């Protein structure tokens, strides 16, 4: 008689008595194990009985004995997989049973599971869990796991740097490798580490607990290994004063990486304060306030932005950092290399910050080119490029491209109500800006000792905004009319709903201002329309001015001067 039959009979007898007497079943199992110490079935049955009895110590001992003696049984592999899945009431009991086994046994089981793993993601997760549980094994596994994850990400051909394997490597594998003092890595590998960490951080924040703090800590660790966001910039400026004047790879790597990191942090803060969606929008403009008359100041009210000081300081810091990056040759070349290595599309927020910085700088042709790029990539909220082109064109004395940009600016702007300003994208602030721009264009068009009169009419009509500030401007215009005596503007009575203007124009027609020949119609008729026009005093001045802008869109022919 074969011993297999006796073992099967003993197991069946023990199993049948389990529902009746647990002690009898345990005694039968012990007797069977004593008779046949090499029987894996008896050990498996004992382990199952112990697990069903919620006995942590007995189940752990039985599992360890089965693993040590019979590792080829698929039941052991299934149990190990179940335990790993639970680790990654029953789950708590399984976790407690895991602690019963020795640390070396647990490490060996984890290594066997990793070796038997097939999926790359599952194997990486198991290895990361094992390293977290047992840091001593991360010395010879941390670098390899990260390299394998990077290779798999490259092979998978991920269009965006937002990858599950890359995310796991950056969140867990990278800090574990960095903090491992026993693990030695070259500075060239630290370069790739910091590159990928920065890419992950900026891609996550642009689109978790604190990507910015983690990136800053990683940068500090990388800088210390090779040995606020504002003080480090000035310290690095002093370092440049000690290094830029005269391989020196550490200094150049720092002056590129740390400076671009602080630049990106400040830039994100800036483009999150202004246009908060890309993270009412705020547009940095040049609003000429004195129409009726390097280290620059951004004038912004504290009501539209309650935290203007910190945002302006961040903008200044980022501008200085970027200026330092392109100032000297080596850092400029390395910065261009790393930036073109990344996404050349420049996203949206970085492009917006670049356009704002260029407009701050003083060069506006490059600003206009960058805004064309931004518009191609892309008053409502989105139409910021129109306002920015308007101010940029007005900067270089164009005075006509400004005018078409302003006229197209308010085509999508319907609502019944120099100095570098910063206004929202709402009508209350934008519409005065557009009217100021148009008034400036026509003020420089009309006061030129020429015979133009439509220019003077356009100055008069657009002088209705913000009265009585245009008092002296309108008085000078009326003096010019008196000198000329032949004012001609057929549109005059369709837009000039100002009682001061109307009663000054009716003064010109009797005796004492001189009988000025006013051609304001396209004897009794002139006064008849005036009696009608004084009834229009009270209508929304913004509405009639906008109607003048849109309907009488032939302002351009005069503005070409």
């Amino acid at each position: 008689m074969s011993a297999q039959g006796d073992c099967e009979f003993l197991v069946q007898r023990a199993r049948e008595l389990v529902p009746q007497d647990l002690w009898a079943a345990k005694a039968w199992l012990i007797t069977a194990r004593s008779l046949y110490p090499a029987d894996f079935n008896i050990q498996y049955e004992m382990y199952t009985i112990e697990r069903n009895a919620e006995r942590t110590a007995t189940a752990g001992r039985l599992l360890y004995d089965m693993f040590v003696n019979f590792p080829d049984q698929p039941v052991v592999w299934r149990e190990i997989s179940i335990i790993t899945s639970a680790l990654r009431k029953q789950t708590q009991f399984l976790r407690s049973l895991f602690e019963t086994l020795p640390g070396r046994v647990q490490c060996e089981m984890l290594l066997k599971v990793t070796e038997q793993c097939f999926n790359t993601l599952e194997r990486s997760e198991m290895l990361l869990l094992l390293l977290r549980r047992f840091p001593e094994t991360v010395v010879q596994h941390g670098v390899g796991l990260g390299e394998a994850l990077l290779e798999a990400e490259t092979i998978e051909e991920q269009e965006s740097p937002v990858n599950c394997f890359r995310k796991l490597f950056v969140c867990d594998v990278l800090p574990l490798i960095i903090n491992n003092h026993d693990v030695r890595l070259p500075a060239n590998l630290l370069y790739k580490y910091l590159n990928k960490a920065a890419e992950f951080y900026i891609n996550y924040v642009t689109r978790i607990v604190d990507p910015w703090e983690r990136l800053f800590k990683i940068l500090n660790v990388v800088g210390m290994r090779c040995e606020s966001y504002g003080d480090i910039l000035h310290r690095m400026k002093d370092l440049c004063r000690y290094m830029n004047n005269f391989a020196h790879a550490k200094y150049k790597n720092q002056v590129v990486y740390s400076t671009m990191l602080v630049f990106f942090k400040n830039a994100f803060q800036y483009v999150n304060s202004i246009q908060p969606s890309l993270f009412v929008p705020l547009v940095l403009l040049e609003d000429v306030s004195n129409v009726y008359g390097r280290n620059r100041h951004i004038v912004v009210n504290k009501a539209e932005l309650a935290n203007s000081t910190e945002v302006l300081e961040s903008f200044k810091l980022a501008r200085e950092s970027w200026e330092l990056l392109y100032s000297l040759e080596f850092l400029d070349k390395e910065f261009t290399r790393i930036c073109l290595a990344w996404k050349t599309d420049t996203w949206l927020w970085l492009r917006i910050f670049l356009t704002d910085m260029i407009i701050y700088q003083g060069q506006y042709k490059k600003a206009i080119a960058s805004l064309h790029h931004l518009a191609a990539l892309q008053t409502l909220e989105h139409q910021r490029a129109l306002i920015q082109l308007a101010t940029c064109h007005f900067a270089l004395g164009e005075y006509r491209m400004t005018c078409e940009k302003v006229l197209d600016l308010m085509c999508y702007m319907v609502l019944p109500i120099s100095d570098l300003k910063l206004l929202p994208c709402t009508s209350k602030a934008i519409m005065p800006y557009c009217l100021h721009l148009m008034l400036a264009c026509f003020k420089l068009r009309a006061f030129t000792d020429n015979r133009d009169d439509m220019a003077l009419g356009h100055v008069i009509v657009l002088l209705q905004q913000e009265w009585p500030r245009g008092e002296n401007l309108f008085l000078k215009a009326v003096n010019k009319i008196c000198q000329q005596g032949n004012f001609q503007y057929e549109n005059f009575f369709n837009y000039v709903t100002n009682i001061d203007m109307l009663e000054e124009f009716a003064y010109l027609r009797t005796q004492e201002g001189g009988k000025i020949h006013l051609e304001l119609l396209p004897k009794e008729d002139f006064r008849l329309a005036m009696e009608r026009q004084v009834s229009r005093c009270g209508e929304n001045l913004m509405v009639v001015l906008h109607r003048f802008c849109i309907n009488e869109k032939i302002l351009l022919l005069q503005t070409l001067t």
Binding site: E471, F474, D500, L502, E503, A506, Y507, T510, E512, V534
Partner: protein, 485 residues
């Protein structure tokens, strides 16, 4: 008088957003307000002269000063809309017409029916207010009217909101250069007709309510009305600064013959007219009134009736072409406004005198009271500033010396005057020169050889040249020279 300066610029032809009713221009609201003001001032203030001045780019006088309020009512609907606003020219024209019609002391209430648009430039209100106030020059700002005026500004522009969005400090300053004599009137709430009528009712109560009084002569009483309403008077700004108005009850205290009062300076002349408190000619026209009896007796006897208008304030009532009426004049507030009558509180009945001061047959009168100190034209002063005076004095001295001893008293009086003046001026050289002239005149005595003439002349010459030395013999001021017996 009353000048109704009303804006006709284009600013006043603006339709008003009045709910319910049709759109009225602000000119129409002004016309209605002035219409109700003229109705009140023709029913209860019928004796007032009113002139309508319309201003725009230039000032114009529609109707001259008249009591024909139907003429002024007609003009309100017969106006044009000349555009541009100029207020300084309007005020210049107001001053011109006021001074060319009434003079320089008759009060004139100016009702400026403005709009609040102020202006834009040149002759605008802001420009002329900022510049000409501190510029002076030939073209002075005619705001402090050269007459006791009261400038009311009926700014019909919504509440003081519409005045505070653009400018109201300009108008409130416009009142201030009139020494605060005025009142800004603004249409409370919206511009509905009821509110403009309320504003003009406030104006009517403030400026055009008749001054009803009571006229008493002991028990003989009369309910009267005094036109114009007397203006408050202030004695000075250091002792008695508060303004004192007259008493509501005019208390006749006595009568003074119109020749004894002569021509008294007065503050202002007023017209006393009885009131009832063809009906007016049949019910109230038959009950005997005291003003009619007083006027008849004053006109016939030729007297006045001194009136107590208050503590230490006194007046007068008299009679009056041919149309005569009872009239009343305010003397200056004080214990003694008329120095020829003494203190008005020292005037009493003739029954308390010993004799009859006015005479048994009325050939005397206690008035006028001679002053205590005679003025220089009543005494004999000695002015020697111009040489003519001194020459006349010495020539009068010598001329009476020839007539000596016939005219000896006048001669010695004149010589005493000369010596007193010379001593009080320290002009002793004149004294010695005059003594030498007396000697020369003595040398040229006529051949008749009057006995006393030589003695008196020689004695006077001796006294003169003894007093010329300055010693205490006759240089004393009171040591008058005495002749020789």
């Amino acid at each position: 008088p009353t000048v109704v300066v009303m804006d006709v610029s284009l600013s006043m032809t603006r339709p008003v957003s009045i709910e319910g009713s049709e759109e009225y221009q602000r000119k129409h609201l002004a016309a209605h307000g002035l219409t109700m003001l003229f109705e009140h001032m023709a029913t209860n203030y019928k004796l007032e002269f009113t002139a309508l001045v319309v201003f725009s780019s230039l000032w114009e006088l529609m109707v001259p000063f008249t009591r024909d309020y139907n003429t002024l009512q007609e003009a309100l609907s017969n106006m044009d809309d000349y555009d541009k606003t100029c207020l300084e020219s309007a005020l210049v024209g107001v001053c011109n017409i006021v001074q060319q019609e009434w003079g320089g002391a008759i009060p004139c209430q100016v009702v400026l029916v403005t709009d609040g648009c102020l202006g834009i430039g040149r002759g605008s209100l802001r420009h002329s207010l900022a510049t000409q106030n501190q510029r002076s020059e030939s073209n002075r700002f005619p705001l402090p009217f050269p007459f006791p005026s009261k400038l009311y500004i009926m700014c019909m522009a919504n509440l003081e909101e519409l005045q505070s969005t653009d400018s109201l400090e300009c108008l409130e300053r416009l009142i201030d250069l009139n020494n605060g004599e005025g009142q800004i009137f603004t249409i409370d709430g919206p511009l509905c007709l009821k509110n403009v009528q309320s504003m003009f009712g406030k104006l009517i109560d403030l400026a055009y309510t008749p001054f009803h009084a009571v006229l008493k002569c002991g028990h003989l009483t009369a309910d009267v009305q005094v036109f114009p309403r007397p203006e408050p008077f202030v004695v000075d700004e250091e002792i008695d600064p508060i303004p004192k108005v007259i008493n509501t009850d005019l208390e006749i205290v006595g009568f003074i013959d119109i020749a004894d009062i002569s021509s008294p300076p007065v503050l202002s002349r007023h017209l006393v007219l009885p009131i009832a408190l063809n009906s007016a000619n049949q019910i109230a026209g038959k009950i005997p009134n005291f003003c009619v009896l007083l006027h008849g007796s004053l006109k016939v006897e030729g007297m006045v009736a001194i009136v107590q208008l208050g503590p230490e304030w006194h007046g007068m009532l008299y009679s009056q072409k041919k149309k005569s009426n009872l009239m009343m004049s305010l003397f200056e507030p004080g214990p003694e406004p008329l120095p020829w009558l003494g203190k008005m509180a020292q005037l009493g009945p003739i029954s308390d005198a010993k004799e009859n001061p006015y005479g048994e047959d009325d050939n005397k009168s206690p008035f006028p009271l001679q002053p205590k100190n005679k003025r220089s034209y009543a005494q004999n002063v000695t002015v020697w500033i111009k040489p003519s005076g001194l020459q006349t004095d010495v020539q009068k001295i010598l001329r009476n010396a020839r007539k000596l001893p016939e005219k000896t008293q006048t001669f010695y009086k004149e010589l005493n005057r000369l010596r007193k003046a010379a001593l009080a001026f320290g002009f002793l050289d004149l004294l010695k020169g005059v003594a030498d002239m007396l000697e020369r005149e003595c040398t040229l005595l006529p051949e008749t050889a009057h006995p006393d003439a030589a003695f008196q002349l020689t004695h006077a010459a001796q006294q003169l040249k003894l007093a010329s030395t300055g010693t205490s013999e006759y240089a004393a001021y009171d040591q008058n020279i005495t002749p020789l017996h």
